[PDB]
Design a protein around this ligand. Structure first.
Ligand SMILES: [Cl-]
Ligand code: NA
Ligand code: NA
Length: 291
């Protein structure tokens, strides 16, 4: 707590202030489009808050609200999460709020939403649920076997990011986390690296938007295998996300097909699975993003 000793700051770059009242646990943030996760995530000309920023926002909110209930052997697990309507930050700043509702069974539901003026009908951008889970069992990946099965072709960053720009998905420097992609049959293995432009941010995030979006990029490569060539697809839902361990700045994303859903493991150099996602799905965007 700063109070008057020094200037009061954000709780987290995606969770600026606690605005909780007797009716509701809630937080509020203001984004202008200058942030790395907006300027470098541009969907047919419009900066859009990426899916992965909502996951980290929920994670940070839950970690704040649940406080000392989170001991060393307790992990946050996100359950079924949907992205309903995009946050577009083109002409004017966006005020993005999150409310958390602790349920009787120990689950937590969250809404992420915005309003233009006070007491407007909120626009719902995303909705999900979560629970606190007993650590228990750190899964491991066989990166050797994964490589071996993904030997059907190599996709370079220059290929991938250019194909994106061609479809209208502009990943700027902070979101070019993919270093290499090995293509398998209904599975892919990508090497990830935190881009140098955000190398000073690795301690600020648990789910780092650069790394996590590069993981979802990897899954979209896997999914696009089974779709029309030049379709832009964007995150639509995920069924589960478990944070096992802290993500480092060199990682791997393994994605496999299960709407076409994908499972994704984000893996450190040692082979430890750090984040595990199940049932990630996408939807095609035609035309421009609207809200
Ligand atoms: Cl657009
Ligand atoms: Na995205
Ligand atoms: Na993509």
């Amino acid at each position: 707590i700063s109070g008057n000793q020094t200037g009061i700051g954000s709780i987290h770059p995606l969770l600026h202030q606690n605005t909780s009242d007797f009716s509701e646990q809630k937080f509020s943030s203001v984004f202008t489009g200058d942030e790395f996760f907006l300027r470098d995530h541009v969907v047919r000309g419009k900066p859009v808050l990426p899916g992965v920023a909502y996951l980290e926002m929920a994670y940070a909110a839950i970690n704040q609200a649940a406080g000392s209930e989170i001991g060393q052997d307790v992990r946050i697990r996100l359950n079924h999460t949907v992205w309903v309507q995009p946050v577009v930050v083109d002409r004017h700043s966006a005020q993005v709020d999150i409310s958390l509702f602790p349920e009787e069974d120990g689950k937590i539901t969250f809404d992420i939403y915005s309003t233009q003026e006070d007491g407007d009908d909120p626009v719902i951008h995303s909705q999900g649920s979560a629970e606190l889970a007993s650590a228990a069992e750190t899964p491991v990946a066989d990166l050797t076997e994964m490589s071996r099965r993904c030997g059907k072709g190599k996709m370079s960053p220059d290929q991938f990011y250019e194909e994106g720009r061609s479809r209208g998905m502009f990943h700027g420097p902070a979101f070019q986390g993919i270093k290499n992609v090995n293509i398998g049959n209904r599975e892919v293995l990508a090497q990830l690296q935190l881009p140098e432009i955000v190398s000073g941010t690795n301690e600020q995030f648990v789910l780092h938007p650069s790394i996590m979006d590069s993981a979802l990029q990897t899954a979209t490569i896997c999914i696009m295998q089974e779709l029309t060539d030049q379709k832009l697809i964007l995150p639509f839902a995920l069924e589960e996300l478990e944070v096992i361990k802290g993500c480092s700045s060199s990682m791997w994303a393994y994605a496999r097909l299960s709407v076409q859903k994908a499972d994704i493991d984000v893996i450190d150099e040692s082979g430890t699975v750090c984040v595990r996602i199940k049932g990630f799905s996408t939807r095609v965007l035609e035309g421009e993003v609207h809200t």
